[PDB]
Amino acid sequence: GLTPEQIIAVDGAHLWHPYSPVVAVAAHGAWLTLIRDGQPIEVLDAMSSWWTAIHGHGHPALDQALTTQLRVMNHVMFGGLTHEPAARLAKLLVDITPAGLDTVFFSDSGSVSVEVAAKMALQYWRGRGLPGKRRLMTWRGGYHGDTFLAMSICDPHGGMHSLWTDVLAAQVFAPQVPRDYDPAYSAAFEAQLAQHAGELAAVVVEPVVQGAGGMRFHDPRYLHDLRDICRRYEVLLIFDEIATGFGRTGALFAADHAGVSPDIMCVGKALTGGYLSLAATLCTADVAHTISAGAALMRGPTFMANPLACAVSVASVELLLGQDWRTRITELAAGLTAGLDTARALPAVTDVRVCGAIGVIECDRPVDLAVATPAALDRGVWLRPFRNLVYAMPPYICTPAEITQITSAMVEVARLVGSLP
Amino acid sequence: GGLTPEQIIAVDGAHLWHPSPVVAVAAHGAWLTLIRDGQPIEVLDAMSSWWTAIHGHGHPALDQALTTQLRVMNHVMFGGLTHEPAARLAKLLVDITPAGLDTVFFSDSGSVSVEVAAKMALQYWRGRGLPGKRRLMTWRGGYHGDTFLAMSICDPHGGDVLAAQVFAPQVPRDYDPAYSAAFEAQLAQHAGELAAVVVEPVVQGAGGMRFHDPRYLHDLRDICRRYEVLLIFDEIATGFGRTGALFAADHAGVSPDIMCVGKALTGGYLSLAATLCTADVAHTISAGAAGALMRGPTFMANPLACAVSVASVELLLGQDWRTRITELAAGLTAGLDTARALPAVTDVRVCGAIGVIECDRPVDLAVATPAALDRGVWLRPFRNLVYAMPPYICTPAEITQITSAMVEVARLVGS
Ligand SMILES: Nc1ncnc2c1ncn2[C@@H]1O[C@H](C[C@@H](N)CC[C@H](N)C(=O)O)[C@@H](O)[C@H]1O
Ligand SMILES: *Cc1c(COP(=O)(O)O)cnc(C)c1O
Ligand SMILES: *Cc1c(COP(=O)(O)O)cnc(C)c1O
Secondary structure, eight states: OOHHHHHHHHHHHOOOOOOOOOOEEEBBBTTTEETTTEEEEEEEETTTHHHTTOOOBBBBHHHHHHHHHHHHOSOOOOSSSEHHHHHHHHHHHHHHSSHHHHHHHHOOOOSHHHHHHHHEEEEEHHOOOOOOOOOEETTOOOOOOHHHHTTSSSSSTTTTTGGGGTTOOOOOOOOOOSSSSHHHHHHHHHHHOOOOOOOHHHHHHHEOOOOOOEEEETTHHHHHHHHHHHHHHOOEEEEEEEETTTTTTSSSSSGGGTTTOOOOEEEEEGGTTTOOOEEEEEHHHHHHHHHHHHHOSSSSSSTTHHHHHHHHHHHHHHHHHHHHHHHHHHHHHHHHHHHHGGGGGGEEEEEEEEEEEEOEEEEEOOOOHHHHHHHTTTTEEEEOOOOEEEEEEOTOOOOOHHHHHHHHHHHHHHHHHHOOO | OOOOOHHHHHHHHHOOOOOOEEEEEEEBBTTEEEEETEEEEEEETTHHHHHHHHHHHTOOHHHHHHHHHHHHOOOOOOSSSHHHHHHHHHHHHHHHSSSSSSEEEEESHHHHHHHHHHHHHHHHHHHTTTTTTTTEEEEEEEEOOOSSSHTTTTTTOOOOOOOOOEOOOOOOOOOHHHHHHHHHHHHHHHHGGEEEEEEEEEEEOTTHHHHHHHHHHHHHHHHHHHHOEEEEEOOOOOTTTTTSSSSGGTTTTOOEEEEOOOGGTTTTTTEEEEEEHHHHHHHHHTSOOOOOOOOOOOOTHHHHHHHHHHHHHHHHTOHHHHHHHHHHHHHHHHHHGGGGGGGTEEEEEEEOEEEEEEEESOOOOHHHHHHTTTTEEOOOOOOTEEEEEEOOOOOHHHHHHHHHHHHHHHHHHHO
C-alpha cells in the first residue's frame, strides 16, 4: 500500500519507461486520479491510455465480464485445449471484420500480431512453391510495433533504421502516402512493387490513419488501389488496424471507408477496452488452407487466447456493437472539430485535423513535454504529445462538455508552444 | 453469447488457429474441468498450463489481488505515468533476482522480453562506442520465443532466411571443462562482433527438456567478463522456484548482465514478462544517444497483471518453497523411476518440479492424450518427450497419479 512518494522513489530507482512520471492512483470512466504536488487531482484521459480505453476505465460491464470469467477459469494452455471466451471472441471478430477474414490467431500484443501476420504471408507463398517471396513492402510514415521484424516496416527515419540496420530485415519502402488522393502516387507505387513482385510476400500498411508515425490521414481511395495492385501482381495485402480498429476512425474498421478487404489483418489496443493486453491476426480461408496444406506457424505464445483477456474483449466488443457507435463517433468528431478550430490561427500551429475520434494539432516545432504536461494538467486533462503533435483519442464515453474540456486544453498547450519563453 | 461445448468446437473448428482440441470449461487448483464424451471431467494440469500455473488456478490470494486492483484502476499508459503495482513488482523482482539486476523493463510476453534484452545489449555497446558488437551467441538446443529475433537463437534445426547468429554445440548434461574451453575459443573468434551470449540456465525447455551442469554458467560468466561480451539468462521457463532454486542462475551463483522472466511471473493468470538489467547496462544505454529502446508496448506494466504477479511472487516467498520443490522433485523421481526399464525409454530425468521421460521415437499425441485423460491427467508430450511441470500445490497423491499416467504413456509408445 505504498505512498505516492514511495512509488516515485521505487520508480526512479528501478523502473524503465518507454522513451519524472506522474503517479496514477485511480481510474474511473473517462477520468484518472493523479498525484500533483502531493495532492490527488482528477484529469480526463484524453489519450484513452494510448488509444485503448474506448469505454472508459472501470466500466461495470467489462469489470463484471472479467470477474465472472475469473470465477470459472483464469487460463489454460491453447495447445490441445479450447474454451468459450476464445470461441465467442473469434466468432465476433470474424463477423465484424471486412469480408473474407474467417480465421483468427490470438497473441498477446500488437507487435506480435504483426509478426504473426508476416509469418502467415511468408508461409503462404512457401506453400505455393514460391519461398523467394519473403520481403515486405510498405509506404513511409508507418508504425507496426517494437519487435525487430515490426521495426523493419516502421518508418526508417522516425524509427532510426540507420542505427538498427544490418540488424533489420531490408524491406521495400514507397514514399509517404499524401493526404489528398493523387493517382500518380498509386501509379508510382505499382511501378515500384512490380520491380520487386517476385521477392515480395506482402504489402503492409495502416489504413486511412497512420498513428505513431505522425498521425497522418490519407484518402481511403489509396486502399482501393493497393487492393487492386496486390491482386494483379500476386502480393498479399496486410492491414494493420491495431490503432484504427473498433470505431476509432468513424467506421468499425478503417478498411470500411474504402470498402476493401485485406488478405490478413491485425487488431489490438482497443480490443479489450484497455483492460488487458491482447491482439489478433485474421486471415482468409485461402491463406489458412494454403499454409495448413503446406509443409509445416508458432509454438506459442504461452498465453495465447487467454480466457480473462478474451472474456473482457467479448464484453468490450458487444458493448460497442450494442449501441449506436456510429452516431457516437460522429458526435465526438464534431466536438473535436469545433473545439480545435481556434488552434488554426495560432502562430506555432501548421495544421489542425480530425478523423473520427482522433483530433490533431500539428505544430511547427517539437512539443516540449516539460511545458505541455503541467499546462494540460493545470487544465484538468492528461495529454501526451509526441514529436510536433498535440493530439487526442478520447474515450467514446466522453460527454460533449468533456470533449470541449479536452480540446480547450489542447489549444492552450499549442498556444504555449507557441509563445514561448 | 453463452456457448455449449459442441458449439465451442464448431466455432473453434471453423475460425480458430491453434499452435481437434478438447473443450475446457473450468480450472481450479491443480485441476482442469475438461469435456470428454459430452461430460465435464476433472483432470490434473500436469503441465501447469505451459509452465505458468505454479500456485494452481483460481488461487484465492491471486484472484483477490486482481479483484482488489480492478476496483481501483484497470490500466493506465506507462508513458509519463507510474503506479503502485508496477513499483511493488519492480521492487520485488530487483530483490529476489541474482544480485546486481536493479532495473526492470516490463513487456507483455516472453518473446518480447527477449527482444528487449537484445535491444539493451545492442544499445549498450553503441553507448560504449562499439557499434560493431551486434551479434548474439548461444548454444544449441535452446528456445527463446517465436518472434523473428528470438527465433534467431532458437535451436537452428527443428524450429535472407533470417538473422545469422553464432552457435556453440549442444551443452552436455555432465560437466566437462573441455566444453567450456571450446566455447571460449569460438567466442574469442567473434568477440568484436558479439553483443551478448544468451542462454537458458540449467534447463533448456522447449528445445528438448535438457539439463546441464550449473558450472557451465559459472564458466560462461567468466568467459563473458574476460572478453567483454554481455551475459543474458532467459529464465522465462526456469524462474520462480521451478528448478529448485528461486532462479536457475542461483544453482551456479552467477548474475547475468540481463535477465528475462515471464510465464509463472503472474501465477499463470495473465500475460506479463520483464527484462532486468544491471545499473551499468542501464546507465550506459541511457547516457547513450538515440533514446527509444521501445515505444512501446502499449500495455506495458499493466496494473492488473502486475498486481496478480505481486500476489504470486509474495505467495511463493511467504512459504518454504524450497522444501516444497524438493518434495515435488522426490515425488517425481520415485514415480518415474519405473519407466527407465521400458523398451522405448532412453532416459528418465528430474530437476526440481520438472520430470522427464525421453523416448527413442516421437510420441503419438493421438495416442498419448486420450491415454492420460482416461487416467485423470492432462499431459502434452512434444517430440520424443513425456514430461510434467506440475503446480507447486500438487499433493504426493496427485504427483503419483501424474507420474503413473506418464509411465503408462511411455509404456504405450513402445507397444
Ligand atoms: N517531447 C516529446 N518528444 C518526442 N516524443 C514524445 C514527447 N512527449 C511524448 N512523447 C511520447 O512519445 C510517445 C510515442 C507514442 N506516440 C507511442 C504511440 C503508441 N501509443 C505506442 O506506444 O505504440 C507518446 O506516447 C508520448 O507519450
Ligand atoms: C500500437 C501499434 C502496434 C503495436 O502494438 P503493441 O501492443 O504496443 O505491441 C502495431 N501497429 C499499430 C498500427 C499500432 O498503433
Ligand atoms: C516460454 C519461453 C519463451 C517465450 O515466451 P512467450 O510468452 O511464449 O512468448 C521465451 N523463452 C523461454 C526460455 C521460454 O520457455
